[PDB]
Amino acid sequence: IHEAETADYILDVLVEGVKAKAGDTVEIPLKFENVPSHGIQSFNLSLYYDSKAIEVLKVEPGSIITDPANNFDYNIVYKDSEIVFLFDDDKQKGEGLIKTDGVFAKLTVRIKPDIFKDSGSTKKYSLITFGESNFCDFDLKPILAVLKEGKVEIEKLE
């Protein structure tokens, strides 16, 4: 559950929709908008996907992530079809806070070619949802995240 909370700061987290064909490998960008200018120190965010339609092959930090080698991690919980992100400005001196809107991560996924098996549709949608989401500033004050789910629109091949 993403907990309903009250705080002094807020941003928006968006899954940017993609239209693809069954069998495609595509990138799904995930964005932050309205990032507080005083900056994010750390965040921990989960997404879920439908493993019947989607295979996650790679997760990469986005351009707004500072010193990703040290500040950015992810883990795919395959059993739960969950992608978990953790960011922290590792050196703790307020110099690598996230203060800019843009892409925070890109997923590279394969759309399973057999998704239309036993189906009479030519178009399907697959939802990318959220779990827990926690963000804070340098002073450990919470920053709320308004989460907006996303969809992959999938066209049958041929």
Partner 1 sequence: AVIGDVNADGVVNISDYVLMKRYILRIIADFPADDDMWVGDVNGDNVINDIDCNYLKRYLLHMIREFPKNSY
Q: Which residues bind partner 1 (CB under 8 A)?
A: 41-44, 46, 73-75, 77, 80, 82, 84, 86, 88, 90, 92-93, 134-136, 140
CA 79/CA 85 separation, integer angstroms? 16
Structure tokens at 82: 């969950």
Cβ proximity to partner 1: between 22 and 32 the closer is 32
Q: What are the φ/ψ torsions at residue 125 (nearest 5 degrees)?
A: -125, 140
Cβ proximity to partner 1: between 22 and 59 the closer is 59
Cβ proximity to partner 1: between 20 and 97 the closer is 97
CA 12/CA 104 separation, integer angstroms? 12
Q: Which positions ≥6 away from 31 have C-beta within 8 Å?
A: 13, 14, 16, 62, 101, 102, 103, 104
Q: Which positions ≥6 away from 45 have C-beta within 8 Å?
A: 13, 84, 85, 130, 131, 132, 133, 134, 135, 145
Rounded to a whole number of angstroms, the minimum distance from the CB of residue 125 to partner 1 is: 26
Rounded to a whole number of angstroms, the minimum distance from the CB of residue 156 to partner 1 is: 34
Rounded to a whole number of angstroms, the minimum distance from the CB of residue 98 to partner 1 is: 13
Cβ proximity to partner 1: between 4 and 140 the closer is 140
Rounded to a whole number of angstroms, the minimum distance from the CB of residue 40 to partner 1 is: 10
